[PDB]
Design a protein around this ligand. Structure first.
Ligand SMILES: Cn1c(=O)n(CCCO)c(=O)c2c1nc(Oc1ccc(/N=N/c3ccccc3)c(OC(F)(F)F)c1)n2Cc1ccc(Cl)cc1
Lengths: 645, 35
C-alpha cells in the first residue's frame, strides 16, 4: 500500500523554528522574532502546529508567564485560551487573561461551567468575584439538548461551587441529589452518569457533617427548623450516608438507651415479665416513678415485643383439644374473647396510620401490605363467624357437612391469617447487631429471585399444556373412590389442566411417582412420549433452571454485601425513631427564629470553612506536594543568580 | 440562577506582591518587604 497523507497541509519553513524557540522557553529569541511590528516578512504569529497547538497555547501548556505576557502585549488572537487555562488549572494564566471553524470545546460550555467541572476552588471564586450566572436546568437537535442539560447539572453538583454560593449547603445537596436520582429514570441512555452524580452529592453532606468539633455543634445542625427536625428531613430524602454517621449515631444511641451476655438477656426478660404492670401504671398515674419509666424508648420497645409474644402464645393455645367440639355454628370460646382485644388494637393502629399518610409511601413498603392482608383476613373471619352463628344451629357430625360451609371457610381463613402474624415477627431482627445485617441483606437479594419466576412459570405452563393435551383423552373415574395425586394410589396426574399444573409443582420435590404416566391400555408409544416429556421437564427445572438461580445469587450477594452496614444502620434508625415520640406508649392489648438562624449560620460558616480548608490545603499531597519543592529550589537558585549579577 | 460570593472578604492589593515573593523564593524582595 503506497500510503499518503490525506486531508492535511504543511505549516511553513520559518515559523517552525519560532515555535521551537517558544517551546524551549527562550525569551530573547521569541522577543526578537515578534519585533516585526506592523512590518512582517510573512511570518504568522497565529501559526498552528500539526497537533493543533498554538504559540500562545504552547506557553499555557508550560504555565510560563513571561512569554505569555510578551505574546499578550502584541495582541495575539486568543479565541478560547481562557477556557484552556481554566481546564489546565493555571491561576496565573487565568489572572492574566481575565483582564485584557474548530473549537475543542462544546459550544454551550461557558468558562464558569468548565471551572465548576474542574472543581478548582481558586478559579471558581475568581470568576464569581467578577459576576457570572449558570443557566437554570428548567427538543430540536435532541443530541445537544441532553448534553447541555447534563453539563449544567455536573457544574451545579460540585462541592466547590456549593460551598461559596449557596444559602444552605445542607439543603441544596438534599434536593439536588434527589432530582438527580429521579432524572436517571427518564433518561435511560445516561442513567450511569446521572446516578453516579447523585452519589457524590450524598458524600458531600456526610463530609460536611464530619467537620464538627464538639457535641454542641452537632445537636444544633440536626435540630434546625419539634425535635430532630432536620434529621427526619434527611431520612425523607433517603440520605443513607448522612444518617449512618458515627458521630450522630452515638447521639441517637444515647437517646435510645437514655453488662455482659448473661447480664442483659436476663434483665430484659425480667423487664418483659411485668408487661401489664407499667402499662396500667401509665393510665393510672403518669408519675416519674412508674409512668415515666416506660417513656424510655428501649423500655417501650421491650413492652411492645413482650406484648406481641404473648399474643403469639394464646394464638398457639387456641388449637388445643382442652379448650367447642365438632358442633355446627358455635359461639366463640374463651380464647377468642382474649384474642379480640389484640385484633381490635391492631385494626385501630392500622386505621390511625391509614389516614396519617393518605396511602402515599404508606402502602408502598412490603411491611404494610402484609399487615393490611392480615387485618382483612381477621375481619373476614369475624364476619363469617357472626354470619354463621345467626343462621345455623344444632349439633351435627362434622363428616356430614357440605363443603363451602361458613364455619369451615371461617376456620380455614383464620388458619391462613395467623401464619402471616407469626411471620411478621421477623421484622424485629433489624434491632440486633448480629441478625440485623443478615436480615437486611436477606430481603435485598430476594428481589433477584422474583425475576427467575417469570421464566419458571413460562416453562411450567409450556410443559403443562403439552402434558394435558397428550393425556386428557385417557382419564377415567370408575373404581376410584379417591381421585388425584394427593392419594395413596396416584391415578389422574395429567387428566385436567388444574391437576397437571400442580402435579408438575410437586415433582420438584420428588413427591410424584413414576407410574402416574401409565394408562389403562396397551399403548406403549404414548406412554413413552409422556414419560419423556416429564423427564425433560425434570431435567430443565432441577438440573438447569434451579442450578443457575443460585449461580447468580452469590454473584449478586457480593454487590449487596459491599455496603451492607449503611443500609442496616438506616433501617435501625428508622425503627428507633418510631419510638421517640408520644402516642404509641400503649400496647395494643391496652389500647383497644431570629436567634436560631444567627447560631445556625455562624456554626455553618465555620463548618464550611473547615471543609474547604481540609479540601484544598490537605489534598495537594494526595507525591505532588514535593513536585513544587524542586520548583521552589530552582526558582530560588534562579533569583539568587540573577540578582547577584 | 444568579450567584454571588457568600461571607468572603478581600485581603489587600500591596500584600499580593509580598505573598508572591514569599511563595516563589526571591530572598531579596522579601527582605525588602520586612525592611
Ligand atoms: C431426557 N431423558 C428422558 O426423558 N428419559 C425418560 C424416557 C422415558 O423414561 C430418559 O430415559 C433419558 C433422557 N436422557 C437420557 O440420557 C441422555 C442424556 C444426555 C444426552 N445428550 N446429551 C447432550 C449434551 C450436549 C450435547 C448433545 C447431547 C442424551 O442423548 C440424547 F438422546 F440426545 F438426549 C441422552 N435418558 C436415558 C436414555 C439414554 C439413551 C437411551 Cl437410547 C434411552 C434412555
Amino acid at each position: 500500500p503506497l500510503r499518503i497523507v490525506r486531508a492535511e497541509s504543511e505549516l511553513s519553513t520559518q515559523e517552525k523554528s519560532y515555535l521551537s524557540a517558544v517551546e524551549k522557553g527562550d525569551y530573547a529569541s521569541v522577543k526578537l522574532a515578534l519585533e516585526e511590528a506592523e512590518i512582517y516578512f510573512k511570518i504568522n504569529i497565529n501559526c498552528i502546529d500539526p497537533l493543533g497547538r498554538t504559540a500562545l497555547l504552547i506557553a499555557i501548556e508550560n504555565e510560563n508567564l513571561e512569554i505569555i505576557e510578551l505574546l499578550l502585549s502584541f495582541n495575539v488572537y486568543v479565541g478560547d485560551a481562557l477556557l484552556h487555562a481554566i481546564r489546565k488549572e493555571v491561576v496565573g494564566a487565568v489572572e492574566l487573561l481575565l483582564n485584557h471553524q474548530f473549537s475543542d470545546f462544546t459550544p454551550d460550555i461557558t468558562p464558569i461551567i468548565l471551572a465548576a467541572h474542574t472543581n478548582n476552588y481558586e478559579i471558581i471564586k475568581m470568576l464569581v468575584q467578577k459576576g457570572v450566572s449558570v443557566p437554570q436546568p428548567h427538543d430540536v437537535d435532541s443530541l445537544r439538548h441532553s448534553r447541555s442539560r447534563l453539563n449544567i447539572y455536573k457544574a451545579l453538583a460540585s462541592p466547590s461551587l456549593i460551598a461559596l454560593s449557596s444559602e444552605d449547603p445542607f439543603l441544596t445537596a438534599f434536593q439536588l441529589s434527589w432530582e438527580l436520582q429521579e432524572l436517571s429514570k427518564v433518561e435511560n441512555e445516561f442513567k450511569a452518569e446521572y446516578e453516579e452524580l447523585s452519589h457524590q452529592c450524598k458524600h458531600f453532606a456526610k463530609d460536611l457533617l464530619d467537620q464538627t468539633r464538639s457535641s454542641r455543634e452537632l445537636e444544633l445542625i440536626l435540630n434546625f427548623r419539634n425535635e430532630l427536625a432536620r434529621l427526619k428531613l434527611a431520612i425523607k430524602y433517603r440520605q443513607k450516608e448522612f444518617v449512618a454517621q458515627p458521630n450522630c449515631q452515638q447521639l441517637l444511641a444515647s437517646r435510645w438507651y437514655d453488662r455482659h451476655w448473661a447480664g442483659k438477656l436476663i434483665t430484659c426478660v425480667f423487664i418483659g415479665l411485668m408487661f401489664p404492670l407499667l402499662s396500667l401504671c401509665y393510665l393510672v398515674a403518669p408519675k416519674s416513678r412508674y409512668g415515666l419509666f416506660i417513656r424510655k424508648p428501649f423500655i417501650k420497645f421491650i413492652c411492645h415485643t413482650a406484648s406481641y409474644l404473648t399474643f403469639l402464645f394464646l394464638l398457639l393455645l387456641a388449637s388445643q383439644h382442652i379448650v367447642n367440639p365438632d358442633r355446627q355454628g358455635p359461639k366463640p370460646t374463651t380464647v377468642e374473647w382474649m384474642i379480640l382485644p389484640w385484633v381490635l388494637g391492631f385494626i385501630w393502629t392500622e386505621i390511625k396510620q391509614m389516614w396519617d399518610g393518605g396511602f402515599q409511601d404508606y402502602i408502598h413498603d412490603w411491611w404494610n401490605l402484609m399487615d393490611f392482608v392480615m387485618n382483612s383476613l381477621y375481619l373476614a373471619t369475624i364476619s363469617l363467624k357472626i354470619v354463621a352463628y345467626v343462621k345455623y344451629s344444632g349439633c351435627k357430625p362434622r363428616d356430614t357437612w357440605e363443603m363451602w360451609h361458613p364455619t369451615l371457610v371461617a376456620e380455614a381463613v383464620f388458619a391462613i391469617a395467623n401464619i402471616f402474624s407469626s411471620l411478621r415477627l421477623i421484622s424485629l431482627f433489624t434491632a440486633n447487631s448480629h441478625l440485623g445485617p443478615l436480615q437486611i441483606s436477606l430481603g435485598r437479594m430476594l428481589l433477584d429471585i422474583l425475576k427467575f419466576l417469570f421464566i419458571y412459570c413460562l416453562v411450567l405452563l409450556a410443559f403443562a399444556n403439552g402434558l394435558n393435551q397428550l393425556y386428557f383423552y385417557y382419564e377415567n373415574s370408575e373404581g376410584m373412590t379417591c381421585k388425584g395425586i394427593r392419594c395413596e394410589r396416584q391415578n389422574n396426574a395429567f387428566s385436567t389442566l388444574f391437576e397437571t399444573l400442580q402435579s408438575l409443582f410437586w415433582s420438584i420435590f420428588g413427591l410424584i411417582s413414576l407410574y402416574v404416566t401409565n394408562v389403562k391400555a396397551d399403548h406403549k408409544f404414548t406412554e413413552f412420549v409422556g414419560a419423556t416429556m416429564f423427564g425433560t421437564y425434570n431435567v430443565i427445572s432441577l438440573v438447569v433452571l434451579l442450578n443457575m438461580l443460585i449461580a447468580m445469587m452469590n454473584n449478586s450477594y457480593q454487590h449487596i454485601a459491599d455496603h451492607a452496614d449503611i443500609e442496616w444502620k438506616f433501617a435501625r434508625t428508622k425503627l428507633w425513631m418510631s419510638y421517640f415520640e408520644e402516642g404509641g406508649t400503649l400496647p395494643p392489648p391496652f389500647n383497644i427564629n431570629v436567634r436560631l438562624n444567627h447560631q445556625y449560620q455562624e456554626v455553618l460558616r465555620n463548618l464550611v470553612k473547615r471543609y474547604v480548608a481540609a479540601m484544598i490545603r490537605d489534598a495537594k499531597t494526595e507525591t505532588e506536594e514535593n513536585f513544587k519543592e524542586l520548583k521552589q529550589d530552582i526558582s530560588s537558585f534562579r533569583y539568587e543568580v540573577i540578582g547577584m549579577m
